[PDB]
């Protein structure tokens, strides 16, 4: 059912674990089948597991890690601070991001929003 | 006008500055007149500067500080990680919070959401 606050801290931390190791099939599986992702926030959202897998396959040398604890509410919502490290066109750089996800009655990410822009890109 | 990413990083950092010193009139002034605040997220929102002032007056020995950089988008939205320290009924404790605000065409906070629950309360 609708995850509890403590359950949310876990799912979201799990998500970063997966993104960090790059297990794409496992990552795509945490989302609801018809989920919508807005990354970065402001851009048109991607919808459904097919498009989400496509996105992650395209994006993931990349390590990620929580930079602070996971803030959670009681209606299945959470937000977390984390850093994404990579190597763009040979050049190494880091991006500071905050993710806001909403889970469904099955513990799957129903909607997710990523907050970040160039001002957070430290290259 | 709609603040730019860099402008958002500033307004939000300014906001924490004010909350940290407790200048209530200055804080209430950053919001639009008909703004809505959801603190914590999930609870019924408070609406308008009168209610917002009431909230802050009630809440603010309290120090606050950004615990990570401010993530910002290009459509006037931002999210930030920060810690709130206080002294509840004689006992000292800290709360980890992440705020998500949306600014209006005047640089005023139009809507604000605070993510946190007991799991972030370290007493
Ligand atoms: C796609 C990307 C790698 C992963 C990633 C980015 C931005 C926000 C994210 C939010 C997530 O929850 C998980 C992964 C990312 C980067 C933008 C530039 C890049 O290489
Ligand atoms: C009201 C409060 C002090 C301030 C505060 C809290 C929670 C989220 C916040 C978010 C803000 O953007 C600014 C101030 C607070 C605390 C909840 C318990 C408490 O004493």
């Amino acid at each position: 059912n609708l995850p509890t606050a403590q359950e949310v801290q876990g799912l979201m931390a799990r998500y970063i674990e997966l993104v960090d190791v790059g297990d794409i099939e496992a990552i795509v599986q945490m989302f609801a089948d018809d989920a919508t992702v807005e990354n970065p926030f402001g851009q048109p959202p991607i919808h459904g597991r097919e498009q989400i897998a496509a996105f992650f396959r395209q994006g993931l040398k990349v390590r990620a890690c929580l930079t602070g604890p996971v803030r959670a509410s009681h209606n299945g919502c959470g937000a977390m601070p984390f850093r994404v490290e990579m190597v763009w066109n040979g050049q190494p750089c880091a991006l500071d991001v905050i993710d806001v996800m909403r889970f469904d009655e099955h513990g799957r990410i129903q909607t997710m929003q990523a907050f970040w822009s160039e001002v957070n890109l430290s290259v």
Side-chain angles (χ1 to χ4, degrees), chain A residues 12-29:
Chain A
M12 297 190 70
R14 164 87 186 309
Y15 172 84
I16 295 294
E17 218 95 81
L18 297 182
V19 176
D20 184 51
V21 307
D23 191 318
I24 299 190
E25 285 148 0
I27 291 170
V28 179
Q29 204 73 58

Side-chain angles (χ1 to χ4, degrees), chain A residues 15-16 19 39 55-56 58-60 62 80 82 84 86 95 97 99 101 112 114 116:
Chain A
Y15 172 84
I16 295 294
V19 176
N39 199 333
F55 168 76
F56 284 98
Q58 185 90 69
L60 292 58
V62 177
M80 62 184 170
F82 66 96
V84 180
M86 62 270 257
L95 186 54
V97 184
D99 267 19
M101 317 175 132
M112 184 253 257
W116 67 269

Side-chain angles (χ1 to χ4, degrees), chain A residues 106-123:
Chain A
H106 300 81
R108 295 198 242 296
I109 302 168
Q110 191 186 67
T111 171
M112 184 253 257
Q113 302 172 302
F115 292 78
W116 67 269
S117 73
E118 308 88 333
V119 295
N120 302 113
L121 190 169
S122 306
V123 60

Side-chain angles (χ1 to χ4, degrees), chain A residues 5 7 15 22 25 30 34 43 47 50 53 79-80 89 92 107 109:
Chain A
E7 274 164 349
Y15 172 84
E25 285 148 0
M30 288 194 83
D34 62 320
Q43 228 52 53
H47 177 86
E50 177 185 46
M80 62 184 170
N89 279 62
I109 302 168

